[PDB]
Structures are given as structure tokens and as C-alpha cells.
């Protein structure tokens, strides 16, 4: 099945791909829909869950808590992902999106995800954004109480910069656990500007978010070169799919990413961890880079 991945030393044990219910709403399935969704991913493997407190409008966590209440025997299968930080305007108390980030709000936020999840603990909580205003003394005393009182397994952040990765890091007796990024062929600045040289440094791996852009690999006219490139790349290596070779492009990086899956069709689902059998070679991979990007490495 897929393969399981150390995300730090002595840190949590995660599948290489993650399934993540950002657009949990937008399927429009009923709770029971949602468990056969479930029970088919973790039946391929697919074991890592990625949520957010604001995801559908502060609702996927809650929907995917009424799956977990229907069967509560599949908790022990997975690792929950969260996140805290953002402050949207869904919240009529928000006239402005923004972030919070201090001790008492990572604190309840993180229960509030508990009760929406319908379960006892997190295996991960991420700082969602990088807040000009995070006291990282602040953050560190809401983990340690989180820690302390079993609520969450380990910890991390997401999109942050080395620097912000090491203020925050430098408070904690703990190793933060991933830097949750963005990585695809359309979103590249992260292989070079330092991001994935420090988590490769550290061998902290990055959960890796809008792999397929989102859709935009699809659908804008910019990447017509990037989709002929893959196709022909897919009928070298026999994939089934241009994705497919996408998530290959991106498993090959030498942080060892973990894709996080988008699509709320499990046949997707199934389709795209097909991608660990392909052997991109390194020409296929900076052939695939070029078409993206239109120019050649220096
Ligand atoms: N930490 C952060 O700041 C952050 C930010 C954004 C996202 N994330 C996380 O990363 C995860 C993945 O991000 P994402 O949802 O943008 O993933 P993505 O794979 O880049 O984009 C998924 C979108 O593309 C569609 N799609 C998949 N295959 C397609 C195909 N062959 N043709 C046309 N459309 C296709 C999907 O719709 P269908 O369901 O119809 O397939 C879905 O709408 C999210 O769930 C979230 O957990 C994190």
C-alpha cells in the first residue's frame, strides 16, 4: 500500500500521500457518503487527513465529525492534521481577515477542532500562516499545554520561511514536526528560495498543498506546455494520467514531499497514488520543470 514516512526524527509516522478535505463542502456528500469516502481511502492506504479550523466556512471539520460519530472505529486508522491561526470574515466578529495567534485562541481553537472532529486528540496542529504579530513565547506555552494534556501529538507550521521556522522552533523541546508549503510544477520559488533546503537539512518533511495547482494545471492557457510535456512524459513511463506524472515530479524532490490529495472522487483518490510506481528520470523531471517555467536551469 502506500508507503509510510518518518515526518521528523522520532517524529509522527505519516502515509506519503495525505488526503485533504479543504473542499469538503463542495462535495456535497451526506455523512454516510463521507464514511465510504473514508474507509476507501484508508483502505488504499491513505492514512494522513489534512484539515484546517477554517475550511467551508468553519464547517469540514464538523462535517468530517459526523463521519468519525458514524464510525468511530476508523480514528484509530488515520492521523488528523489541523490548523490554527487564520481569522476569516465567515465569522461576523471578523471585519477583516487576519491572524491570530496567541496562547489562549491556539489553545481553544485546537479544542474547538477536537469537538468538530468528534475525537480526543490530534496527531498534528499547524500554525496556519506566519503572523507578523506571533510571539513565538506565546505559541510555545499554548503547544506545551496541548502537549502536556494529551490534546495534540506533535506540532508544526505551515508556509512559514526558514526564519520564521527557526524563531518558532527555538522555544520548543520539541522538533516541529513539517513546514506545510506549496509545491507543483505551476509553484516552484520554493525549491530554490531556501524552504525545502532547510526541512531536507533538519529531514522534517513538507506536506505539499495545491500539487495540481488547484486546477490550474488543467485549465489555464499558461500551462498548455506544461500539459503537453507531462502527457508525453506519461507515455514514456506508462502513467495513466498527466497527474499522476505530476505527483511523481513532486514525490522525486529530495525534501520528500508528501502530496496532499484534493479531488473528492475517490477514483482520483486511487489514481493518483499510482504515481509511487513511476521512475521519472532526471531528464523527464527538468524536462517537466522547463515546461512549466519556459526556460532552462542556469
Ligand atoms: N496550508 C495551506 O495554506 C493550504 C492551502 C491550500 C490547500 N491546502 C491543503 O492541500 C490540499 C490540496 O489542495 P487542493 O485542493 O488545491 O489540491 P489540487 O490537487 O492542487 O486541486 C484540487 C482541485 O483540482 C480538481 N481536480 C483534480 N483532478 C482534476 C482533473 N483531472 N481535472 C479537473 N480537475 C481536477 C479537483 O476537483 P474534483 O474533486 O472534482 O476532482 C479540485 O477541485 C487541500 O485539501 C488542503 O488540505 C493547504
Same mark, same amino acid.
Given at each position: 500500500?502506500?508507503?509510510?514516512?518518518?515526518?521528523? =526524527?522520532?517524529?509522527?509516522?505519516?502515509?506519503?500521500?495525505?488526503?485533504?478535505?479543504?473542499?469538503?463542502?463542495?462535495?456535497?456528500?451526506?455523512?454516510?457518503?463521507?464514511?465510504?469516502?473514508?474507509?476507501?481511502?484508508?483502505?488504499?492506504?491513505?492514512?494522513?487527513?489534512?484539515?484546517?479550523?477554517?475550511?467551508?466556512?468553519?464547517?469540514?471539520?464538523?462535517? %468530517?465529525?459526523?463521519?468519525?460519530?458514524?464510525? =468511530?472505529?476508523?480514528?484509530?486508522?488515520?492521523?488528523?492534521?489541523?490548523?490554527?491561526?487564520?481569522?476569516?470574515?465567515?465569522? &461576523?466578529?471578523?471585519?477583516?481577515?487576519?491572524?491570530?495567534?496567541?496562547?489562549?485562541?491556539?489553545?481553544?481553537?485546537?479544542?474547538?477542532?477536537?469537538?468538530?472532529?468528534? $475525537?480526543?486528540?490530534?496527531?498534528?496542529?499547524?500554525?496556519?500562516? =506566519?503572523?507578523?504579530?506571533?510571539?513565538?513565547?506565546?505559541? &510555545?506555552?499554548? %503547544?506545551? +499545554?496541548?502537549?502536556?494534556?494529551?490534546?495534540?501529538?506533535?506540532?508544526?507550521?505551515?508556509?512559514?520561511?526558514? &526564519?520564521? %521556522?527557526?524563531?518558532?522552533?527555538?522555544?520548543?523541546?520539541? $522538533?516541529? +514536526?513539517?513546514?506545510?508549503?506549496?509545491?507543483?510544477?505551476?509553484?516552484?520559488?520554493?525549491?530554490?528560495?531556501?524552504?525545502?533546503?532547510?526541512?531536507?537539512?533538519?529531514?522534517?518533511? =513538507?506536506?505539499?498543498?495545491?500539487?495540481?495547482?488547484?486546477?490550474?494545471?488543467?485549465?489555464?492557457?499558461?500551462?498548455?506546455?506544461?500539459?503537453?510535456?507531462?502527457?508525453?512524459? +506519461?507515455?514514456?513511463?506508462?502513467?495513466?494520467?498527466?497527474?499522476?506524472?505530476?505527483?511523481?515530479?513532486?514525490?522525486?524532490?529530495?525534501?520528500?514531499?508528501?502530496?496532499?490529495?484534493?479531488?473528492?472522487?475517490?477514483?482520483?483518490?486511487?489514481? &493518483?497514488?499510482?504515481?509511487?510506481?513511476?521512475?521519472?528520470?532526471?531528464?523527464?523531471?527538468?524536462?517537466?520543470?522547463?515546461?512549466?517555467?519556459?526556460?532552462?536551469?542556469?
Amino acid at each position: 500500500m502506500v508507503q509510510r514516512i518518518a515526518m521528523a =526524527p522520532q517524529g509522527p509516522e505519516f502515509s506519503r500521500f495525505v488526503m485533504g478535505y479543504w473542499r469538503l463542502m463542495d462535495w456535497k456528500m451526506s455523512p454516510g457518503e463521507l464514511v465510504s469516502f473514508i474507509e476507501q481511502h484508508l483502505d488504499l492506504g491513505v492514512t494522513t487527513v489534512d484539515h484546517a479550523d477554517i475550511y467551508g466556512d468553519y464547517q469540514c471539520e464538523a462535517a %468530517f465529525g459526523e463521519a468519525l460519530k458514524r464510525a =468511530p472505529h476508523l480514528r484509530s486508522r488515520m492521523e488528523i492534521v489541523s490548523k490554527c491561526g487564520i481569522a476569516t470574515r465567515a465569522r &461576523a466578529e471578523n471585519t477583516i481577515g487576519h491572524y491570530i495567534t496567541d496562547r489562549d485562541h491556539i489553545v481553544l481553537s485546537a479544542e474547538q477542532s477536537l469537538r468538530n472532529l468528534a $475525537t480526543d486528540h490530534l496527531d498534528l496542529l499547524l500554525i496556519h500562516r =506566519p503572523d507578523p504579530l506571533m510571539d513565538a513565547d506565546e505559541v &510555545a506555552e499554548a %503547544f506545551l +499545554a496541548l502537549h502536556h494534556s494529551g490534546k495534540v501529538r506533535h506540532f508544526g507550521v505551515s508556509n512559514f520561511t526558514p &526564519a520564521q %521556522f527557526t524563531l518558532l522552533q527555538s522555544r520548543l523541546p520539541f $522538533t516541529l +514536526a513539517t513546514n506545510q508549503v506549496e509545491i507543483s510544477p505551476v509553484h516552484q520559488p520554493l525549491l530554490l528560495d531556501g524552504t525545502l533546503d532547510q526541512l531536507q537539512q533538519l529531514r522534517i518533511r =513538507p506536506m505539499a498543498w495545491s500539487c495540481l495547482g488547484g486546477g490550474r494545471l488543467f485549465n489555464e492557457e499558461c500551462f498548455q506546455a506544461l500539459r503537453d510535456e507531462l502527457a508525453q512524459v +506519461a507515455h514514456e513511463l506508462n502513467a495513466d494520467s498527466i497527474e499522476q506524472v505530476v505527483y511523481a515530479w513532486v514525490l522525486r524532490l529530495p525534501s520528500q514531499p508528501l502530496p496532499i490529495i484534493g479531488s473528492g472522487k475517490i477514483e482520483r483518490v486511487r489514481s &493518483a497514488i499510482v504515481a509511487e510506481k513511476l521512475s521519472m528520470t532526471r531528464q523527464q523531471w527538468f524536462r517537466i520543470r522547463k515546461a512549466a517555467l519556459g526556460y532552462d536551469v542556469p
